[PDB]
Subunit: 419 residues, 2 copies
Amino acid sequence: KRVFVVGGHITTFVGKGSPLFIDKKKENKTLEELLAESINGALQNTGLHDGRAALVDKLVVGNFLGELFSSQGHLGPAAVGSLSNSSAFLNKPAVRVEGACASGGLAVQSAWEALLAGTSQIALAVGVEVQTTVSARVGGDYLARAAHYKRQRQLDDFTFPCLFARRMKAIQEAGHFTMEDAAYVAAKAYASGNRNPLAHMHARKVTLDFCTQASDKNPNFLGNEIYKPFLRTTDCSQVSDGGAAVILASEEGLQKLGLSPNDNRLVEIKSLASAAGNLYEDSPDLTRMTTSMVAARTALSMAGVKPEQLQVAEVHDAFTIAELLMYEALGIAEYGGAGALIRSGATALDGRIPVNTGGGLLSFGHPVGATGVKQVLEVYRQMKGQCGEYQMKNIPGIGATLNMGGDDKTAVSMVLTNI
Amino acid sequence: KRVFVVGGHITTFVGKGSPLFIKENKTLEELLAESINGALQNTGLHDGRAALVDKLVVGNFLGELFSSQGHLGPAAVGSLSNSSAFLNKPAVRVEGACASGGLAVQSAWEALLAGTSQIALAVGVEVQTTVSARVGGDYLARAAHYKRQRQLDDFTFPCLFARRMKAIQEAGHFTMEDAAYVAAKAYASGNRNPLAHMHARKVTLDFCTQASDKNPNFLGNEIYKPFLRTTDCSQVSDGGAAVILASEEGLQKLGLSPNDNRLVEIKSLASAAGNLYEDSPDLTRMTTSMVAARTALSMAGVKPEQLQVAEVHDAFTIAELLMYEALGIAEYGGAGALIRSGATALDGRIPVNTGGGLLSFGHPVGATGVKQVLEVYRQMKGQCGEYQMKNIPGIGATLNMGGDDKTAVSMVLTNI
């Protein structure tokens, strides 16, 4: 019973705001291409790039949307397809999973499940998404496929960020953290995105006083004219294309690789949980995310990892406001105080536990289904030294992940131990 | 290493053609409400004894536009409401075009042997009764290259076979007339099933052939247009189909044993996926299903001629005739003959799609996958009713389809 990480390549993330945008200056990167980049490079890192593909036992696709973003689904066998002497690989099991945002961690969970079962010996997981297609207010209409469209659409054409735009005021009506605490997040996040080469919002960074209110270039944009002012553009994560694939193996599979559970290139995983809460009912604790807590305190407790021993984390914060409800679930911190221990440097690349060091969903990119997988690779690149530039001298042998689903209606967390 | 089946309830399937058509029609939220509450009920649990279902898998294929809503994993956690306590258990949603059901079961199957879970549930469902029929096929092209296969027609989905309809007529494997004895037989078996979509219909063979007008084609590919009928198109149908699964380790808590006269075991389960950027050069063959077959049962070494009852995911009669070539119960070079040997009928060797199949039972894309596993369960234990076969088995099989044979899931159900 041992789950391993052996590699995985992450693509460049694009969108408006990233000068890597095309507008009838060419034909932008397609979902078929976005997965082409993601997996060919995921293979390449691993000791195989040719007919040595024929050993990948299980394929899992963590796509969330494409039935309208590319008007096309069934991405399982699409992973079988995009290799093209480089097309031989076919007729291997392949599924597609969905969990709104945690579509990536769920995919890894499928291979995770596939691993211990004996279904497969060496598997791959692949996250990807394409939100750069058309209208921005229309895109949120297709993101309400995470919450009750029947009960939560009669709010606005921007109904998705409203769950937090209301939690933005629900928290201001509390003494846990302030609107000003939601400011020190973006600048820090946008800064970390300035360190990452392939970051979506790589070429931007402003003063804290601007990631606060008193702004106009980065304000809200909503329609809920009472919850409208209760968000900023600094809160909305990045509408971003981009893939993020990963290869996984077994101890039994290791023998064929010519490896051993020791190699200075792999990272092991011994704790992995998951959870899902009702979406027909929203949190009575608008000042809490409960589904992530289960996925945390249950996961690592299998490995009994003391959260204060954590060295580097990655979270699926859809929003800065959601980012501040992370460390309450991820037991590395506690409750009753959020926007203080963040300025203890326990979030920064030069401190206790640097979180979202590549920029996170604010500047790294948020390809809904590729955001899930990438974190597992974000704590891999630093635990082995591949992040580059934004590589931390603070070296770990312990990591963690945190995936989000809707309004904390699905959660996936992990423990990455450098065995 | 033992996979079991312990129960599962299938809903009424509706649509145009079924007089159960409408009030405000049954919603996907309701379609899963019926499916799981009844899936629980059969099994020795309907209350707080839900809190033992370790893993939840959702085999929905479409809802992001059929109900403009996804994330059906935690939606399964939601629809219980003293009857809402169940929350905070793992739940995923899977997709594989049509084989979305078998893939879901595969996830729990995987979840079982892993030790992820001890007692799991799988649930298929779909809602294709929303709006326009020519518009619905536009949302079913999410199984094939919309970029390479949409410039054909607004009815582009049934064209893969409407072309295979002529590709096979240009061959000596089977004829257009062999694709006729299927529907009547299928529509007949659907007349035996109470909850069948197209339950209240059945015509003469001479009508499931051409020379018809009430059941003709309807396409736009004016050259491949005549090469299909309405008897071929499977049923645009709402309906859920849920199932509970367990482990030998889980069995001890149930108060059961791997013997019970209520359960069915599974010892063979495979899966496969082929490129959709490339279509079959053998338009007279489906290759992905063959792997899922000859690899699956070979784990249990089951001799296909010992098979007693099958269920297949035939999207079309034409696809139904390419089933027994993969499901090794029959062979190649002859298709529309051994079917009239009674080796498809409820009173013969291997009755297949005895409830009517995707032509009369219903085709809720994601619930069609799961239901077969329950279609060979109800007859192997005696729950089909009416259309229950005296020919009693201790061996069964499934066959799930994905796109144009781009995904396949097959099983072996042995009554242990």
